[PDB]
Amino acid sequence: LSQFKDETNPLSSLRHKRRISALGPGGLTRERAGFDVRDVHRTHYGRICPVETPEGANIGLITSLAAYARVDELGFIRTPYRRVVGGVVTDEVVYMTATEEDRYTIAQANTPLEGNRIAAERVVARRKGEPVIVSPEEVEFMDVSPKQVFSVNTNLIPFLEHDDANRALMGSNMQTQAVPLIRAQAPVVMTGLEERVVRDSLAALYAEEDGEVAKVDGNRIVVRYEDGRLVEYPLRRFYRSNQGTALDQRPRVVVGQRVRKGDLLADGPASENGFLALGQNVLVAIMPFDGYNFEDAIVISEELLKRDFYTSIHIERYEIEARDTKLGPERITRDIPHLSEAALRDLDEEGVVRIGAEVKPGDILVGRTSFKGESEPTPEERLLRSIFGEKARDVKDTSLRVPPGEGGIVVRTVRLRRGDPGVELKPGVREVVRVYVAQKRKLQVGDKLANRHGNKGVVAKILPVEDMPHLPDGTPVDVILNPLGVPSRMNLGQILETHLGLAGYFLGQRYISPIFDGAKEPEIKELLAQAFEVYFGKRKGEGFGVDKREVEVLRRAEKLGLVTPGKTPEEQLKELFLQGKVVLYDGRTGEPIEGPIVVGQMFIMKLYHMVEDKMHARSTGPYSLITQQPLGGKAQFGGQRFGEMEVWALEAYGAAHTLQEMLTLKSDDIEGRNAAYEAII
Amino acid sequence: RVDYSGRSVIVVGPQLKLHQCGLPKRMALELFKPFLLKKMEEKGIAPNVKAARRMLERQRDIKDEVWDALEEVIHGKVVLLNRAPTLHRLGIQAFQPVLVEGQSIQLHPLVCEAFNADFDGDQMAVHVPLSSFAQAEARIQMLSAHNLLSPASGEPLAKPSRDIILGLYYITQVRKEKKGAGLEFATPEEALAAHERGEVALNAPIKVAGRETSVGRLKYVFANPDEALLAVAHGIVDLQDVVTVRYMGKRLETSPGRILFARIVAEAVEDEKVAWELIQLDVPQEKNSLKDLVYQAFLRLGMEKTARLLDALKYYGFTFSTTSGITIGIDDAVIPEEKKQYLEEADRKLLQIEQAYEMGFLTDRERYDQILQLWTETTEKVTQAVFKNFEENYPFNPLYVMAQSGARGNPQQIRQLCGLRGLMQKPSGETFEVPVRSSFREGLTVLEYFISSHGARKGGADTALRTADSGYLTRKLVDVTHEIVVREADCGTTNYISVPLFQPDEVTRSLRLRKRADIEAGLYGRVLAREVEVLGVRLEEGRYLSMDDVHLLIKAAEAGEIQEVPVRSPLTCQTRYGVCQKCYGYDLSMARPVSIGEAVGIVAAQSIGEPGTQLTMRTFH
Amino acid sequence: GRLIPAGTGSDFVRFTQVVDQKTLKAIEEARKEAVEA
Amino acid sequence: MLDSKLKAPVFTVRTQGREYGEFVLEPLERGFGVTLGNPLRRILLSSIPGTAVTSVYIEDVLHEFSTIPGVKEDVVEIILNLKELVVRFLNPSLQTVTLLLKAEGPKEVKARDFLPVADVEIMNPDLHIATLEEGGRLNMEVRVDRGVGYVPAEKHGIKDRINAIPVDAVFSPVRRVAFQVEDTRLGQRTDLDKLTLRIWTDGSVTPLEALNQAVEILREHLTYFSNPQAAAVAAPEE
Amino acid sequence: MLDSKLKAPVFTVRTQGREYGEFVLEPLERGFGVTLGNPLRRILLSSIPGTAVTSVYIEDVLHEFSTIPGVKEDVVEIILNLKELVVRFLNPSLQTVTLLLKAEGPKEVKARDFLPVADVEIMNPDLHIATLEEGGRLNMEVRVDRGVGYVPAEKHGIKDRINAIPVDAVFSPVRRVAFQVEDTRLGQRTDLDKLTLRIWTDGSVTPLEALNQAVEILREHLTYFSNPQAA
Amino acid sequence: AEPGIDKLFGMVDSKYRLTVVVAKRAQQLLRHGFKNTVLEPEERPKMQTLEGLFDDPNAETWAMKELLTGRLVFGENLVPEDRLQKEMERIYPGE
Ligand SMILES: Nc1nc2c(ncn2[C@@H]2O[C@H](COP(=O)(O)OP(=O)(O)O)[C@@H](OP(=O)(O)OP(=O)(O)O)[C@H]2O)c(=O)[nH]1
Numbered sequence A: 001l002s003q004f005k006d007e008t009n010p011l012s013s014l015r016h017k018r019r020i021s022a023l024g025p026g027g028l029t030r031e032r033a034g035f036d037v038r039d040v041h042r043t044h045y046g047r048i049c050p051v052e053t054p055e056g057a058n059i060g061l062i063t064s065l066a067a068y069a070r071v072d073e074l075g076f077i078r079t080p081y082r083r084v085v086g087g088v089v090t091d092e093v094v095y096m097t098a099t100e101e102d103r104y105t106i107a108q109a110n111t112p113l114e115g116n117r118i119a120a121e122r123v124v125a126r127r128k129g130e131p132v133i134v135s136p137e138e139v140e141f142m143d144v145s146p147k148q149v150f151s152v153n154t155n156l157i158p159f160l161e162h163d164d165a166n167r168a169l170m171g172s173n174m175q176t177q178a179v180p181l182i183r184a185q186a187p188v189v190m191t192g193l194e195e196r197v198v199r200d201s202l203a204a205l206y207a208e209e210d211g212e213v214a215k216v217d218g219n220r221i222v223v224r225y226e227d228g229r230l231v232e233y234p235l236r237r238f239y240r241s242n243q244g245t246a247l248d249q250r251p252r253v254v255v256g257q258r259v260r261k262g263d264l265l266a267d268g269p270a271s272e273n274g275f276l277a278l279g280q281n282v283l284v285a286i287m288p289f290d291g292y293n294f295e296d297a298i299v300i301s302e303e304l305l306k307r308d309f310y311t312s313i314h315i316e317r318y319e320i321e322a323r324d325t326k327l328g329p330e331r332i333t334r335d336i337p338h339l340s341e342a343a344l345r346d347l348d349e350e351g352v353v354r355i356g357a358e359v360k361p362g363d364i365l366v367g368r369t370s371f372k373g374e375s376e377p378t379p380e381e382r383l384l385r386s387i388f389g390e391k392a393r394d395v396k397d398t399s400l401r402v403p404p405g406e407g408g409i410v411v412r413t414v415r416l417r418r419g420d421p422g423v424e425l426k427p428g429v430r431e432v433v434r435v436y437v438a439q440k441r442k443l444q445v446g447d448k449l450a451n452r453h454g455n456k457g458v459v460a461k462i463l464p465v466e467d468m469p470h471l472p473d474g475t476p477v478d479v480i481l482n483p484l485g486v487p488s489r490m491n492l493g494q495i496l497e498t499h500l501g502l503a504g505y506f507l508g509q510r511y512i513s514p515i516f517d518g519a520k521e522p523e524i525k526e527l528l529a530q531a532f533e534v535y536f537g538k539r540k541g542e543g544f545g546v547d548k549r550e551v552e553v554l555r556r557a558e559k560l561g562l563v564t565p566g567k568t569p570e571e572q573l574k575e576l577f578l579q580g581k582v583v584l585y586d587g588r589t590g591e592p593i594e595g596p597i598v599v600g601q602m603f604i605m606k607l608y609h610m611v612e613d614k615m616h617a618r619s620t621g622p623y624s625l626i627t628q629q630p631l632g633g634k635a636q637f638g639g640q641r642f643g644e645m646e647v648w649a650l651e652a653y654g655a656a657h658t659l660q661e662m663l664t665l666k667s668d669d670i671e672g673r674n675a676a677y678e679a680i681i
Numbered sequence B: 001r002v003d004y005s006g007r008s009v010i011v012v013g014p015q016l017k018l019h020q021c022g023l024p025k026r027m028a029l030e031l032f033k034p035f036l037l038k039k040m041e042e043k044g045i046a047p048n049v050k051a052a053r054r055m056l057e058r059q060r061d062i063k064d065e066v067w068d069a070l071e072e073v074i075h076g077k078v079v080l081l082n083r084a085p086t087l088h089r090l091g092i093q094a095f096q097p098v099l100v101e102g103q104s105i106q107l108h109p110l111v112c113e114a115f116n117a118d119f120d121g122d123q124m125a126v127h128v129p130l131s132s133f134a135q136a137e138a139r140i141q142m143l144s145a146h147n148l149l150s151p152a153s154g155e156p157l158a159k160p161s162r163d164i165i166l167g168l169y170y171i172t173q174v175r176k177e178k179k180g181a182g183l184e185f186a187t188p189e190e191a192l193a194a195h196e197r198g199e200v201a202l203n204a205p206i207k208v209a210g211r212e213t214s215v216g217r218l219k220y221v222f223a224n225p226d227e228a229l230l231a232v233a234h235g236i237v238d239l240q241d242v243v244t245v246r247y248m249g250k251r252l253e254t255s256p257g258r259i260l261f262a263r264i265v266a267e268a269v270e271d272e273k274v275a276w277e278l279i280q281l282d283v284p285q286e287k288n289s290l291k292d293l294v295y296q297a298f299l300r301l302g303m304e305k306t307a308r309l310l311d312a313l314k315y316y317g318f319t320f321s322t323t324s325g326i327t328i329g330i331d332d333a334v335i336p337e338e339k340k341q342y343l344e345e346a347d348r349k350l351l352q353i354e355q356a357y358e359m360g361f362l363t364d365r366e367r368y369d370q371i372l373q374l375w376t377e378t379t380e381k382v383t384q385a386v387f388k389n390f391e392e393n394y395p396f397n398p399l400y401v402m403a404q405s406g407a408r409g410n411p412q413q414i415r416q417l418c419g420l421r422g423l424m425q426k427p428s429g430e431t432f433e434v435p436v437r438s439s440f441r442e443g444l445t446v447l448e449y450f451i452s453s454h455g456a457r458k459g460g461a462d463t464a465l466r467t468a469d470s471g472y473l474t475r476k477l478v479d480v481t482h483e484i485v486v487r488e489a490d491c492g493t494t495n496y497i498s499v500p501l502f503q504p505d506e507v508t509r510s511l512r513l514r515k516r517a518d519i520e521a522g523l524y525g526r527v528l529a530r531e532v533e534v535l536g537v538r539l540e541e542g543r544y545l546s547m548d549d550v551h552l553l554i555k556a557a558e559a560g561e562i563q564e565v566p567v568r569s570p571l572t573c574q575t576r577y578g579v580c581q582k583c584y585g586y587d588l589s590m591a592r593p594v595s596i597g598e599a600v601g602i603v604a605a606q607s608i609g610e611p612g613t614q615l616t617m618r619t620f621h
Numbered sequence C: 001g002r003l004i005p006a007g008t009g010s011d012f013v014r015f016t017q018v019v020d021q022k023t024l025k026a027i028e029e030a031r032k033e034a035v036e037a
Numbered sequence D: 001m002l003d004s005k006l007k008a009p010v011f012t013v014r015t016q017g018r019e020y021g022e023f024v025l026e027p028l029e030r031g032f033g034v035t036l037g038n039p040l041r042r043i044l045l046s047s048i049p050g051t052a053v054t055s056v057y058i059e060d061v062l063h064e065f066s067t068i069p070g071v072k073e074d075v076v077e078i079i080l081n082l083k084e085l086v087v088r089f090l091n092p093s094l095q096t097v098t099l100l101l102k103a104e105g106p107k108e109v110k111a112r113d114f115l116p117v118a119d120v121e122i123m124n125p126d127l128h129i130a131t132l133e134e135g136g137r138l139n140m141e142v143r144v145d146r147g148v149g150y151v152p153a154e155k156h157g158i159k160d161r162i163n164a165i166p167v168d169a170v171f172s173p174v175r176r177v178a179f180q181v182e183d184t185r186l187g188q189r190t191d192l193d194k195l196t197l198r199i200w201t202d203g204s205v206t207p208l209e210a211l212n213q214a215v216e217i218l219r220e221h222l223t224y225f226s227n228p229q230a231a232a233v234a235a236p237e238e
Numbered sequence E: 001m002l003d004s005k006l007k008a009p010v011f012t013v014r015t016q017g018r019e020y021g022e023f024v025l026e027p028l029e030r031g032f033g034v035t036l037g038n039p040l041r042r043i044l045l046s047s048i049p050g051t052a053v054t055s056v057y058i059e060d061v062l063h064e065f066s067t068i069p070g071v072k073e074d075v076v077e078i079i080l081n082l083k084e085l086v087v088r089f090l091n092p093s094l095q096t097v098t099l100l101l102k103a104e105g106p107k108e109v110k111a112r113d114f115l116p117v118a119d120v121e122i123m124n125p126d127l128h129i130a131t132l133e134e135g136g137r138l139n140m141e142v143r144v145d146r147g148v149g150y151v152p153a154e155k156h157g158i159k160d161r162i163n164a165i166p167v168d169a170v171f172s173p174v175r176r177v178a179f180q181v182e183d184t185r186l187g188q189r190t191d192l193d194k195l196t197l198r199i200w201t202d203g204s205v206t207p208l209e210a211l212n213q214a215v216e217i218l219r220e221h222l223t224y225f226s227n228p229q230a231a
Numbered sequence F: 001a002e003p004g005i006d007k008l009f010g011m012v013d014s015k016y017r018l019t020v021v022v023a024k025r026a027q028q029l030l031r032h033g034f035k036n037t038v039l040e041p042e043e044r045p046k047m048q049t050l051e052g053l054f055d056d057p058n059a060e061t062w063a064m065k066e067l068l069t070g071r072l073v074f075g076e077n078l079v080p081e082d083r084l085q086k087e088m089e090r091i092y093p094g095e
């Protein structure tokens, strides 16, 4: 029941404290009780998120507590209801249990009201689970918020109502894998819980009373509060999380700036002025692009990288031991015995590598020499080392090296000998060196990308901007999202997001839609109406009419039955823009895309890297003592499990030799693997 | 665990050809290391191997002269690739490295459908076959451009899929134009006149005293094929408009894109004769119409010339799809006017039912069971109108197309979007008597949303209940089929079985022809036990049932000349501990008879447990 | 760990041999070495 | 070093007859493959010196939908036998010309039955327009022209005779053009392009010429960025 | 009266500051709007060369992930500013320059604070680099290099001193490129392109210069069409 | 695909023989240098590297090219055991 703290980002760190498992001391998995238990129950309303849970095996077993949910003095989960009497709704709000709840006819949160008063004929209400259209007189309690039905990770997805639950589960889930961008943006369309999460998470640093700011630097802030207190707040700086992702503050206040209590002093690692800042807002065209987005694959405007948009700073921690041995103590010496000295440069530091150095794979973090071989020199090497000058030192190159596939640049080393300051030593271990390697990780073919409505795909091609589809004002698009990843999904919120975006873009605004309240289809077209001015209602004041290609499109558009035949080539477009689609020009030819394409702003997060799903490759290396099957080192990655299922794969194929060599030559054939190697060499 | 292996994330590789993959050179140089060290010794890159290996144990010490030696090793060779879960033969497929930069493996998008991998970060593992025999095996019998058809069906399994269809459909498809109606007068230019003052559309349906024609067919008469596209070039017309063109002496009434396609195929097969007599130049192309095109081009033209066709078709689908410019803005969710009118009625009949229960005439379950049936018929009525709409008013609506073209999404999916999600079951099983009335375009109720999460749960606790282990069936089927190999050619036994062509399901014993597919299933590529003489043709004892023949005998059974077929099975085989090649029949992945030595039983097992993850878990009706 | 009893490991094919038009003269290498005197 | 300027691109051309050509150009700076592809292509499809029939005089027809007595091809069929017919000149002066054809009986008609009037040298030797069988007779005065592109009849005015009809103008003597850009490598540079262009022409102009002169029409066009005049920009308004 | 060929048209400018210029061309025949107006846009967006910070050395900092006492900005953010700084090399043959910036005590450090060098014009001397507080001190050096395209940190050593930071270098001085293609009439013929290349830039290069250059490139490219060779 | 994959299928009665033939053939073809090659100077496989066409090191790819000319012959029985393990060494240097 205890585990590593999820802290990929602040939100993930908060979801984890709000977790519920049935496993541990209570019956677990081997007995399953599937379909029961794992099923979302009629009593979960506002007690558990019906749409948050792990995918696959552990479904419905692990689960997350609904936003407004509360645990009473006994331990029973309570959701709040406001009592209503005689169709006159009171604010007097009660936290009923599961059982208390079954004693009443509570009504849904969106009953049309008239101040205190219900203005509805038929009122749509739960009666101990069963929904029934009823009369006001019969009501007794009412739902506080549409929100109270869902966890917090769920409550952060605008247009949830338009999003199918499956694909919105994925959203709730992937926000856990948001990894602080160094240009962390809060989203363009928000739900409301953005500020309130960042505070309750302790993502940002707030002011605990009214006062004037004394000092501000990257390091710390001193503030003088109205009572006379001058308290220093360190700005916890470039700190390492469990998962690597850098937690640390960044101040948003200047010197002698008078300030109110609870005002923002330092942003989170993922807060953009107290606002939960998990990803980045981007101009997305949705449409197929030459297969480059073939099955959930996604394409990327080079321009995203120059803006350091999806860059991310990652601290990686290495250790090295200095153990006592039966063959004599091993050392952490700068003097590794080999053939180079020009390849010891950044090292020098009496073992350790100098704080500041670049490291690629193979480079040495901490040099180490260990006694190995059992005293004597090899029957062959005894003849050998003599010729060179047989000191043949009984020490080996067990130096801590840069694991293959990138390291980065050093930020901090820690050299702990004997633990005499008050650090608990390890038995039979002399000393330990730590190193920390940081790296800014930009976006790259392979990097994965997600949105809160459950869109997840991998960056399959980073085109140059010379190629990207562009708007008439030359503004090219940032990301190209194939649309086939959408009917089947049934996550329309991603479109209700791309539209509103297209507005706020030109409207120079951002919005707050709330979970089941929020923007409706009329207001958005109406927002697009004002946005059509900014965009086009000033295209002619610069002296430019309409393009010879907009003529070409509008034809094909009105035939599609998109725009009115008869209306003016100008206001045909305005219609077409209120639909969300504009007119893109294929950045290559300069010709237009037949038919309109819906561009617009959408908010996207760079999903986080696990080292299991790091890029791996073995040619050959270590081998388990006992079974003598291939094994992992640190510089060496073991082989792939070749399970029964894959074995059949080739049998089926009549791949005779191939199978056998997977079953001998490349696993357990002690003799032949050596025999093989040589032959190949 | 295996000693020449590796793994990475997969990014799609459109530019790739059918028999190759994008591989990190970074990866290869581990994998191929020892092979590389030699070439380094063969070249001046190293004095010796220890120095050559030394040259590499630090990334930055690796001289770039080296990479020109990796490409050199690789040339000729192939890697393998497999993907969890390996649920059949094709979870492993051989290709030729194309060394690419970066940390991921680009992968052709046709083998996608086989491997069952998409790109929300599915990873693949790569192995190297070592022995000059293994690579031999790998290239001749695992290369992704020789395994075109499927071991389970016979049907091709590398087909136009997504974007590839969406592309092809849209440029073959011809258009319908409404503002023109049905008009009947003198042709001369009197026809063109109405179009000059625009009262008639252009590809409007029109019939003057003469024939049935567009406008359309008249105004634009093309001499040769390339004179047509030369017009669309100058944007005087599209490949969607209907038009008259002359070819090989014929005078045809199609579109230009029909030809464009009828050409795309022509060229990539190097055989204009056998090319044009395979194209259905009479309908838009889609999932099936190509799936067939392929199959034909696979018996008619070699497996090798079939590989080209697939990339050519893949290349165009893409290109064309891009510029074709579909998308999906909220406005493409085109709700029909009928949804009210129906929910009006349904709402008012629910009155009647409630009055008849309030009265005493129906019992509880009698009431319950009534209401639900209503909605069943209703949820259909909506789903129906939604489509007539998309056929009569928006026959090019993105959703509508992807739907129809087999590029994406089914009836029930489009419904939940436009129509109405409908009946939701409870968690205990019993259906809610109240359905989700909204759609996804309308946005569900805070409580319509809850309702629909119980079966939303179940629809997960049924696949995850087979994710942890449903290699379960195949385990079992392999445990009892592995030994069966095709040992003898002819295992020489008079006896057989007779596949029926008629079903007794109008019941009881009310006869009827079994769906085509059903037959194809039991007859395709079997070997004839006794000379069948049907439809003025003797299909001679010991024939190999060509698919053309599975179609002929059906024609013959529709014709009324035959009801059973004497076919030779494994069910009555007499190979000592195995199955003879004639008692099996075709290969199925190739359209030949099965070659001896084939792991037929293993194929059997897989093929039957491949699709186990898509059999509805427990009884839900 | 034995070779599989199928495919290229089926007693049917396995023993297939290959030789070239010139080493086809290995039949006449043993062809003209018999009768003496 | 990292590195420097660009390698001079080997413009490979393998020729095959007088209608088809393959033009390989490599290596190109990433993206230039297309940057050359398009503008060259459309120019090859809208500019090259063309000659087209635009109005056809008919002997025995007042309305162009009959089948002329004693001839088993339509009015509509015969006009399309003209659209496949290549004409070339040797004179700079010619801006429009009219030709004549005469025949009836059990012989065999070609393209040579047009009179070699002026410098007009009619290219295609053996062509087929129609076949006669009996006492039905015909004699025409078909109008030819010089221009560029593709022109519909319903998009041009001024007709030949009252015994003639407006037709569609097949000027551009280039029939079909293909080009696929493809990633090519230069030892240490996988990013680079490689342009392959494929041109089909009616045999009037050599594809290589059509190319040469296309590339020139561009070169020539790019000079019109010369004689600049200044103007005020726009208004702040806010 | 040769009835097959055309007459030369009206190239015209309309410059604003140093970073905007429209470029019209009536009349151009049907099509040629895109035909011509496009390729340039690529060339223009892609291949016009500029200048951009390539290496930073700050007095006591050892690498990007470090914070300087009395300085709000951290080095990662200080740099992110310099990414914006735009410079002019007045003498074509100048290939690089290292700007110097000392600063102690309370003040907002702008791009003006950079120690002047001859023939090198800081184009946005007001760009905010860093704000330092009481007791704060930031002494720095900053490398600049004429270049093309986009060369990112990882793809160069640069190593002036051995505590330098090599920064991602966005070279093109061309910040955006539209091109309208509307219609104009010449009496008779009423379908003619009005090409209007609109190039905003950065300050280091003139919309006009940038345009002159791109055109010259395409030309210098059209060069490799002559001189055959069969394979 | 691979060269004349269909035609090379026809040469054998079964899929696998051609795999056994090819590999075994290649074995000898890249045992004795490429000295045994029943495939002429001008019809040998080649690469493009360093700007220089040099013969393809891919034994497996040669044997296929070879058999495609019919110059080889194959069967279940052609010669005895170690009785071939000397013939090809003498006609084509076994060093
Ligand atoms: N043969 C086979 N099919 C599989 C396999 N896994 C999934 N499918 C099929 O692919 C289609 C959609 O798969 P998903 O990937 O789950 O769809 P999604 O994109 O909406 O998540 C389904 O039918 P569909 O929508 O009718 O397919 P389609 O018409 O979209 O091709 C499903 O039956 C498999 O291992 N083998």
Ligand SMILES: [Mg+2]
Pocket: A361, A402, A403, A404, A405, A406, A407
């Ligand atoms: Mg590493």
Ligand SMILES: [Mg+2]
Pocket: B118
């Ligand atoms: Mg899928």
Ligand SMILES: [Mg+2]
Pocket: B118, B119, B120, B121, B122
């Ligand atoms: Mg997946």
Ligand SMILES: [Zn+2]
Pocket: B491, B492, B493, B569, B570, B572, B573, B574, B575, B579, B580, B583
């Ligand atoms: Zn049998």
